[PDB]
Each structure stands twice: as C-alpha cells, then as structure tokens.
Structure 1
Amino acid sequence: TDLPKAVVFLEPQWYRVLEKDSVTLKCQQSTQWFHNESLISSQASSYFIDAATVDDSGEYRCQTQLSTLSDPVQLEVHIGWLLLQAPRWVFKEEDPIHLRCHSWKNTALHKVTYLQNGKGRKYFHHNSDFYIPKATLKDSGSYFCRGLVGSKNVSSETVQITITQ
C-alpha cells in the first residue's frame, strides 16, 4: 500500500442532478467502480449513467490496477421540475460563482429568475446560467430559481451558499 490515491470526476460537474439526466463518472488499465460499497463495474474506466433515477444516488468510489481506493463522491438525484446547480456551495471572496437553473429533461424554461434570500437577483427572458464573477460577503444566503414551462410556474428547492473570510 505504497502508491497514489485515485480521484473521482463527474461530467457534467453537477453533483446534484434530476431524473432522466446523463451522468459520466470518470477515474484517473483495470478500473473498478463502487456504489454504496457494492462492486458495480469490473474493468471499464468510466461509468455512464444514462437516465438518472433516485436509486443512482449515493456514494461512488473507484480504484485502478496501480492505485488505491478513491475518496468518496456523493451523487444526489432529485425529483422535480427545477434544480439549481453550482460547481460547489463554499466560495472565498473574489471566487467566481456559476449557477444553473436546470429543468427536468432540459425542457425549455422562459421568464427565469434567480433569487437570493427571497429577492430577485437576476431575470432572463430565456433560461441562462447565472455567473457572479467576483464573490463578496453580500452573496451569501439561500438561493433558488424559478420560471415558466409553458404557462406553468415552477421553482427549485433552495440551496445555501457560504462565502468565507
């Protein structure tokens, strides 16, 4: 056990997904996959989840022929119209914050708002991602997004963003 630690990467980078999303777990050649500590794939280097379902949630790990068992990655598959995604939830001052208002099956979403602590931060006529170039302390709080799928008004559950000092 005198080797290096392998690392799990996701593509796209969203650790929180909706059902019917595609996910691709990658390990940095005999590559093994672990899901809730049960062995899933014997040799393949990446593990493709084509159409996510709630049972795909949990802990994924991996190892290769010449490397040790990776630190775990928690994947979370949600049920609903809207899921607010970010590369992570803890930012330091001046870091970029990238938020995505993700709809179920990429259904088209018009009149979109991203809210911070109950108040409008950004509106778009057609769905787009929300980029804050330089995080300050003022960006901390609870966020959600919302919009219209056809004439139906839908919104995501809230997510907490902390800015550190």
Structure 2
Amino acid sequence: LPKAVVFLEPQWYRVLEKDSVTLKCQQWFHNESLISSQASSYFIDAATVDDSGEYRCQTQLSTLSDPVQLEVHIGWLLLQAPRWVFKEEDPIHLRCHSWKNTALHKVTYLQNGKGRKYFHHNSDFYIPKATLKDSGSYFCRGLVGSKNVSSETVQITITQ
C-alpha cells in the first residue's frame, strides 16, 4: 500500500545548467537505473543537460514512486512555474530565473507578446487569483549588466 512520491527543493522542475537541485524521496532511479548513493535525498550540485529526464524512488518500506520529470535548460533566463495548467482563482507563481543567479534588472514578464509586469530589480511575478484571461504564452526578459536577455516562452492554460 505505502507507495512513494518525489519532491524537489526548490520546487522548480525546469532548471538552468549550474542550478542546485535536491530531490526528496518520501533507492533512486535515474531514467530507470541506479545511483552512487541510496541516501534519503539525491543532491545535484550543478546541473547539466544530462541530469534531465525521469526520476523515480523507493524505500525499504515503500513501493516504486511515480515518474517525476526534471528539465535542465541552457540559457540566460528561464521562466519557472510550479506547473502550466491552473484552475480559475488558482494562484500563479512565476519566477524569472537567471543563469547562476546573475543580477538581473529592468525585468518584464510578458503575456502574448505584451509587457504585463515590470520590475526595477528581479522579482517573482505572483498572480494571486487566476482568471481565464491569464491564458497564453509567457516569457520574461531583463538586463544582465548592459546585455538584454530573454527566456524561451511557456504556455499557461487556465481551466474552469
């Protein structure tokens, strides 16, 4: 009966190369294999694209966990969210994550090609109350030094 579930610290499943991740098991299977350590939590110090893919876990007292996909991306900026589909009135938490947490300023989160929120210094964009109007393709952008950089887009969909 007692199954297993994996949990990421921080929660972002889309990460950037060089990001630290911590996977929580509630033995480890990377793309269905093993690992150098069957400790409690698997720790990735500095992600690379090979760290991407599928993770399951399992303990002496608990069965094989569900599949948990980790995407490791390459780029200056990555728009992170806990997921990409939301119910009306759901809270939407977006983070414009910069490579190596390099200082990012004059940050804009865009929806469907239009600036939606602007910040002088990098901040997350938190929508407390999702509505149908929140559907569309998002990306963020900003200045690292004098260099103007943008993330790839992500599609957010809102369901009733």
- Shifted more, 16-25 versus 42-51: the winner is 42-51
Note the aligned Cα RMSD (angstroms): 1.0
Structure 1 runs of 4+ aligned residues shifted over 3 Å read: none
Structure 1 residue runs of 5 or longer lacking an equivalent are: none
- Deviation of 1:40 (Å): 1.1
Q: Distance in 1 between matches of 2:2 and 2:158?
A: 32
- Deviation of 1:41 (Å): 4.2
Q: Distance in 2 between matches of 1:153 and 1:70?
A: 41
- Deviation of 1:120 (Å): 0.7
Q: Distance in 1 between matches of 2:2 and 2:130?
A: 34
| CA displacement, residues 87-131 of structure 1 (integer Å, 9 cap, x when unaligned) | 111100001000000000000000000000000100000000000
- Deviation of 1:42 (Å): 4.6
- Shifted more, 83-92 versus 33-42: the winner is 33-42
Q: Distance in 2 between matches of 1:120 and 1:96?
A: 20
Aligned to 1:42: 37
| CA displacement, residues 34-65 of structure 1 (integer Å, 9 cap, x when unaligned) | 00101114520100000000000000010000
Q: Distance in 2 between matches of 1:130 and 1:42?
A: 37
Structure 2 residue runs of 5 or longer lacking an equivalent are: none
**Residue 160 of structure 1: SS of its match in structure 2?**
strand
The structure 2 residue matched to 1:16, chosen from 11, 14, 17, is: 14
- Deviation of 1:5 (Å): 1.1
TM-score by length of 2: 0.98
Q: What are the equivalent positions in structure 2 for 1:82-97 lying under 5 Å apart?
A: 82-97=77-92
1:104/1:13 CA distance change after superposition, 3 Å: same
Aligned to 2:64: 69
**Residue 40 of structure 1: SS of its match in structure 2?**
coil
Q: Distance in 1 between matches of 2:131 and 2:122?
A: 25
**% of aligned pairs identical?**
100
Q: Distance in 2 between matches of 1:70 and 1:46?
A: 14
Q: Distance in 2 between matches of 1:66 and 1:151?
A: 54
Q: Distance in 1 between matches of 2:152 and 2:139?
A: 6
Q: Is the 8 A contact 1:41 1:47 kept in 2?
A: no
1:85/1:50 CA distance change after superposition, 3 Å: same
The aligned length equals 160
**Residue 125 of structure 1: SS of its match in structure 2?**
strand
